[PDB]
Motif scaffolding. Structure first.
Motif, PDB file in Angstrom:
ATOM      1  N   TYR A  24       0.827  -1.198   0.000  1.00  0.00           N
ATOM      2  CA  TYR A  24       0.000   0.000   0.000  1.00  0.00           C
ATOM      3  C   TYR A  24       0.872   1.262   0.000  1.00  0.00           C
ATOM      4  N   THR A 224     -10.013  -0.982   3.302  1.00  0.00           N
ATOM      5  CA  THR A 224     -10.647  -1.145   1.994  1.00  0.00           C
ATOM      6  C   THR A 224      -9.693  -1.860   0.993  1.00  0.00           C
ATOM      7  N   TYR A 225      -8.430  -1.433   0.988  1.00  0.00           N
ATOM      8  CA  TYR A 225      -7.409  -2.042   0.132  1.00  0.00           C
ATOM      9  C   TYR A 225      -7.184  -3.517   0.430  1.00  0.00           C
ATOM     10  N   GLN A 227      -9.245  -5.571   1.780  1.00  0.00           N
ATOM     11  CA  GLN A 227     -10.473  -6.337   1.436  1.00  0.00           C
ATOM     12  C   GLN A 227     -10.775  -6.329  -0.087  1.00  0.00           C
ATOM     13  N   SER A 228     -10.011  -5.598  -0.886  1.00  0.00           N
ATOM     14  CA  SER A 228     -10.372  -5.377  -2.281  1.00  0.00           C
ATOM     15  C   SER A 228     -10.070  -6.646  -3.076  1.00  0.00           C
ATOM     16  N   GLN A 232      -7.222  -9.551  -2.280  1.00  0.00           N
ATOM     17  CA  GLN A 232      -7.794 -10.852  -1.948  1.00  0.00           C
ATOM     18  C   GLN A 232      -7.392 -11.947  -2.947  1.00  0.00           C
TER      19      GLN A 232
END
Length: 260
Positions: A24, A224-225, A227-228, A232
């Motif tokens: 990230y 959010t990243y 879980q994206s 994943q």
């Protein structure tokens, strides 16, 4: 200057949080994500205190005495398998559930009793509060408590001590398994991803990134990243975890399995 956040807790989840964090930050200029261990119990306690941005946990918040789950917000990101591991010279690669329980309770004290070498067994445990330990006792040991043993403070330390200690057995998340130790099959079911998806291998838990309240800013963006679908489908699976969409079962608070 930039934007910084800190996630602490579960050592089972730590490798995924560290890998996702570095990925990230290399993709988003001016961001910093600090990741620590400490175990599930520390993750939950620190997030409740509001002392960190993310509490990394292998357990639902309500599983830990003294945590108010209603002030925290859950975010599930993965499933992690947990496997017994042994020193490579103990002379066995499989145990039944009954043998495993008898070993961890101290009823069986030599590996020869289960078809292995004539060698005294050395139990290695994690400390209370470890989410690996809770999951292992519940789904590996049928809620039996372990005999008092040498304790280690992390997944990584359990692995290194097992590797170098004759007679040793412990438990660790699937990612930590490497050539220095031997994962055991249980009831001749192997600790594989496919077997976790069907619950044929029962020792697994959901991985959680808890926040205090609904998150904003970098905390929200990072979760959010993680879980994206892009992340994943790639990083989660590469590091040994299961994306939750791979699961063919769901598990509720009473331990009830529904097949899905």
């Amino acid at each position: 200057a930039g934007e910084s956040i800190t996630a602490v807790g579960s050592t089972a989840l730590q490798p995924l949080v560290e890998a996702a964090g570095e990925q990230y930050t290399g993709e988003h200029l001016g961001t910093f994500i600090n990741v620590q261990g400490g175990g599930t119990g520390t993750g939950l306690s620190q997030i409740q205190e509001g002392a960190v941005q993310i509490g990394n946990s292998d357990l639902f918040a309500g599983e830990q005495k003294g945590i108010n789950a209603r002030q925290l917000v859950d975010h599930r990101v993965a499933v992690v398998g947990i496997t017994p591991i042994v020193n490579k010279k103990v002379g066995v690669k499989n145990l039944s559930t009954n043998q495993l329980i008898k070993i961890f309770t101290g009823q069986i004290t030599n590996w020869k009793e289960v078809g292995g070498a004539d060698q005294s067994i050395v139990l290695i445990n994690r400390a209370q509060g470890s989410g690996t330990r809770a999951t292992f006792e519940q789904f590996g040991l049928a809620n039996h408590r372990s005999k008092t043993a040498q304790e280690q403070d992390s997944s990584g330390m359990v692995r290194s001590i097992v590797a170098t200690t004759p007679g040793a057995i412990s438990y660790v998340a699937f990612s930590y398994v490497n050539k220095t130790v031997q994962a055991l099959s249980l009831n001749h079911v192997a600790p594989t991803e496919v077997n976790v998806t069907t619950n044929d291998w029962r020792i697994w838990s959901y991985e959680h990134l808890y926040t205090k309240g609904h998150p904003t800013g970098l905390t929200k963006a990072f979760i959010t990243y993680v879980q994206s679908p892009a992340i994943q489908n790639t990083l989660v699976r590469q590091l040994g975890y299961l994306s939750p969409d791979q699961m063919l079962v769901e598990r509720d608070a009473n331990g009830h399995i529904t097949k899905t």
